[PDB]
Amino acid sequence: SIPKATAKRLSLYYRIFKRFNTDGIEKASSKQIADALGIDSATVRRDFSYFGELGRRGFGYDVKKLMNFFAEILNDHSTTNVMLVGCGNIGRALLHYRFHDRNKMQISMAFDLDSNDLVGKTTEDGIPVYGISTINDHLIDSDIETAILTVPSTEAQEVADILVKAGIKGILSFSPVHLTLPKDIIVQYVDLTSELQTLLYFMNQ
Amino acid sequence: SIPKATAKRLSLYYRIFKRFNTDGIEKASSKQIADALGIDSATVRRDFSYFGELGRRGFGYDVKKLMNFFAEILNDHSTTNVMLVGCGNIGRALLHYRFHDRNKMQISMAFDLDSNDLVGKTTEDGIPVYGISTINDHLIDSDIETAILTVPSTEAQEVADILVKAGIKGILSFSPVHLTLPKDIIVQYVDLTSELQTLLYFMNQ
DNA sequence: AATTGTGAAAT
DNA sequence: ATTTCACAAT
DNA sequence: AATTGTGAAAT
DNA sequence: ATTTCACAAT
Ligand SMILES: NC(=O)c1ccc[n+]([C@@H]2O[C@H](COP(=O)([O-])OP(=O)(O)OC[C@H]3O[C@@H](n4cnc5c(N)ncnc54)[C@H](O)[C@@H]3O)[C@@H](O)[C@H]2O)c1
Ligand SMILES: NC(=O)c1ccc[n+]([C@@H]2O[C@H](COP(=O)([O-])OP(=O)(O)OC[C@H]3O[C@@H](n4cnc5c(N)ncnc54)[C@H](O)[C@@H]3O)[C@@H](O)[C@H]2O)c1
Ligand SMILES: [Mg+2]
Ligand SMILES: [Mg+2]
């Protein structure tokens, strides 16, 4: 919430309260939440307590009340449109994933080089693909200010600048390259090679 | 190294020293490394100092000496064979990524349901795909004890147990589901929806 | 009413 | 900065 | 030889 | 537990 460590769990808590809600479970204790998340229960309680007093003593937490509270925190009572740039290996994995079946996000358009064979067409799921040179045109009346960036590493900086210039305010980047961009622009990195190589480091200790 | 925070950066440092080495840069200061990584230089120095005294005062760090030192720490003077289970959206993104062009890892085989149409064939890059029921057979003389797990969430636990039973010691899992497995088995999670939704949380604060 | 919310300690 | 302990409050 | 390695403080 | 300060050592 305030604390970065807690803010990184919010999405994990929301999923769990949703899963309980689907499974017909109406109450959950912080021990049950801790165990489904693989963390300690004291962190769940300290996490929730930044948002006020959400449980009751001796009972636990009302699953629906918490599912809905977290949806509000996560802005999941409104729809967020995202774009994806770079329709290549990971690009396409994401494009075909129905984010919107579980949360109120969706990739509503994608971009690639103007010469890509997918430009001018749609995804099997109806997501239109356009040339990167037209980004300014399509960004009008999309409500998009968030980009998924899945272009080659050597092009990440150059394409990040195009996105920012064109109005993008937040980037999830799969390139392992620190983007130099103004500090108001939020950048979250996913680094798959580093994740795999770090797994191997832990296995060898 | 000892400290978890530092161990999670090792892979990031290795890449940077490799990149410098490719770019013909022979020396690097902790400020230059900090700036390419987007962190503070005091953490770079404190990070490196867990491994001893790797630089020299007034100079910085010898890029080749550090590239090679990190390759040793990361076990990158030997080849690690990985398997991938679940040849679906993210599965395939990974299968087509040449991990071995940059590090000494490779996905040397994959698995899917026995009825999948890819079973019995190879990847465009020569990676053979087999039925999950044959996992014990193929795990013989592969040197594989690491799995990438990219099956649906509802099947993650059931397939994680098959992998462990069959000899797998480390799992990188893309399912957002805490796997319950013995504590000697190292599990690293990647959670793409939570990463995207957390980006959006940061953008709205 | 069996489990929360939170100071204080530990890391 | 973050986790975990530990217990009076309900 | 301009920058490291590290106690001490801050978080 | 982790980061960042800040400075004597080279
Ligand atoms: N695929 C993986 O599993 C994997 C693994 C580790 C890291 N990564 C990283 O993720 C990034 C992308 O990976 P990938 O394998 O999907 O790469 P890819 O080459 O398969 O996809 C890149 C896409 O971006 C497009 N592109 C290039 N320049 C562009 C531009 N100026 N504007 C718009 N689009 C442009 C390309 O045409 C291509 O479709 C890389 O930084 C890579 O290092 C991917
Ligand atoms: N694709 C994405 O961008 C994305 C985004 C967010 C989360 N995820 C998560 O990653 C996981 C996989 O995603 P996906 O979209 O690639 O799913 P997918 O359904 O596209 O792929 C799953 C694959 O696993 C195979 N499979 C099923 N049971 C199996 C078994 N018992 N043994 C071996 N293989 C089996 C399926 O045949 C299929 O090929 C899910 O947990 C999903 O929530 C993916
Ligand atoms: Mg990489
Ligand atoms: Mg998910």
Side-chain angles (χ1 to χ4, degrees):
Chain A
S1 167
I2 288 269
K4 216 145 180 164
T6 300
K8 287 169 170 166
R9 284 185 283 265
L10 277 38
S11 185
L12 306 177
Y13 290 130
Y14 184 37
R15 166 156 40 236
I16 288 295
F17 282 121
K18 265 150 41 169
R19 181 177 294 164
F20 287 178
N21 184 40
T22 297
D23 299 344
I25 300 166
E26 287 161 324
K27 85 197 158 206
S29 77
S30 82
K31 177 50 169 165
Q32 287 157 340
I33 300 151
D35 291 350
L37 270 67
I39 68 193
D40 184 76
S41 66
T43 288
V44 181
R45 298 205 297 285
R46 166 89 55 189
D47 281 5
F48 295 177
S49 87
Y50 296 113
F51 289 93
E53 305 200 40
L54 282 26
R56 43 156 161 172
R57 315 204 170 211
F59 265 89
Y61 301 85
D62 180 85
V63 172
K64 256 140 181 147
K65 168 150 151 30
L66 268 291
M67 172 175 92
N68 283 319
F69 180 78
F70 274 90
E72 296 172 314
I73 285 168
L74 288 164
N75 192 33
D76 214 58
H77 289 153
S78 177
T79 311
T80 300
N81 294 307
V82 180
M83 65 173 275
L84 179 151
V85 189
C87 300
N89 301 127
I90 27 57
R92 270 147 22 207
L94 296 156
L95 269 182
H96 299 131
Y97 186 74
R98 317 283 74 236
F99 288 101
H100 194 85
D101 289 337
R102 294 174 175 287
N103 296 275
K104 304 216 178 84
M105 290 162 174
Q106 74 198 338
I107 297 163
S108 69
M109 67 184 65
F111 290 86
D112 207 90
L113 298 167
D114 302 312
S115 61
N116 193 88
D117 272 336
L118 208 53
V119 163
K121 282 148 147 46
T122 76
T123 270
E124 295 182 333
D125 306 283
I127 302 176
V129 184
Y130 307 118
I132 190 52
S133 67
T134 62
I135 185 171
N136 284 352
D137 302 312
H138 294 94
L139 232 0
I140 284 161
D141 246 22
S142 76
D143 285 336
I144 298 165
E145 75 183 45
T146 305
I148 302 172
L149 187 64
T150 51
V151 299
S153 313
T154 58
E155 316 301 305
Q157 178 56 49
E158 159 177 352
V159 181
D161 280 310
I162 285 160
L163 303 178
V164 163
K165 235 165 172 273
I168 299 299
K169 300 297 161 204
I171 304 189
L172 187 65
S173 183
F174 279 77
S175 292
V177 175
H178 173 74
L179 305 175
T180 300
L181 296 174
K183 65 177 153 34
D184 65 311
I185 304 290
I186 305 292
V187 179
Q188 197 97 2
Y189 293 102
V190 175
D191 191 340
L192 300 172
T193 296
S194 151
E195 224 73 66
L196 183 46
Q197 183 157 63
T198 293
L199 176 52
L200 277 11
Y201 178 78
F202 288 126
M203 295 162 68
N204 293 161
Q205 328 315 317
Chain B
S1 167
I2 288 269
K4 216 145 180 164
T6 300
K8 287 169 170 166
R9 284 185 283 265
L10 277 38
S11 185
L12 306 177
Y13 290 130
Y14 184 37
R15 166 156 40 236
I16 288 295
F17 282 121
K18 265 150 41 169
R19 181 177 294 164
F20 287 178
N21 184 40
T22 297
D23 299 344
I25 300 166
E26 287 161 324
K27 85 197 158 206
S29 77
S30 82
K31 177 50 169 165
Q32 287 157 340
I33 300 151
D35 291 350
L37 270 67
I39 68 193
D40 184 76
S41 66
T43 288
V44 181
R45 298 205 297 285
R46 166 89 55 189
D47 281 5
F48 295 177
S49 87
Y50 296 113
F51 289 93
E53 305 200 40
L54 282 26
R56 43 156 161 172
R57 315 204 170 211
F59 265 89
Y61 301 85
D62 180 85
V63 172
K64 256 140 181 147
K65 168 150 151 30
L66 268 291
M67 172 175 92
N68 283 319
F69 180 78
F70 274 90
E72 296 172 314
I73 285 168
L74 288 164
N75 192 33
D76 214 58
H77 289 153
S78 177
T79 311
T80 300
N81 294 307
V82 180
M83 65 173 275
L84 179 151
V85 189
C87 300
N89 301 127
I90 27 57
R92 270 147 22 207
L94 296 156
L95 269 182
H96 299 131
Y97 186 74
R98 317 283 74 236
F99 288 101
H100 194 85
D101 289 337
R102 294 174 175 287
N103 296 275
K104 304 216 178 84
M105 290 162 174
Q106 74 198 338
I107 297 163
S108 69
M109 67 184 65
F111 290 86
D112 207 90
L113 298 167
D114 302 312
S115 61
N116 193 88
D117 272 336
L118 208 53
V119 163
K121 282 148 147 46
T122 76
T123 270
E124 295 182 333
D125 306 283
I127 302 176
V129 184
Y130 307 118
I132 190 52
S133 67
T134 62
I135 185 171
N136 284 352
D137 302 312
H138 294 94
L139 232 0
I140 284 161
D141 246 22
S142 76
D143 285 336
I144 298 165
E145 75 183 45
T146 305
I148 302 172
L149 187 64
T150 51
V151 299
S153 313
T154 58
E155 316 301 305
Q157 178 56 49
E158 159 177 352
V159 181
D161 280 310
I162 285 160
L163 303 178
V164 163
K165 235 165 172 273
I168 299 299
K169 300 297 161 204
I171 304 189
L172 187 65
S173 183
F174 279 77
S175 292
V177 175
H178 173 74
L179 305 175
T180 300
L181 296 174
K183 65 177 153 34
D184 65 311
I185 304 290
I186 305 292
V187 179
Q188 197 97 2
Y189 293 102
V190 175
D191 191 340
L192 300 172
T193 296
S194 151
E195 224 73 66
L196 183 46
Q197 183 157 63
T198 293
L199 176 52
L200 277 11
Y201 178 78
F202 288 126
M203 295 162 68
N204 293 161
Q205 328 315 317

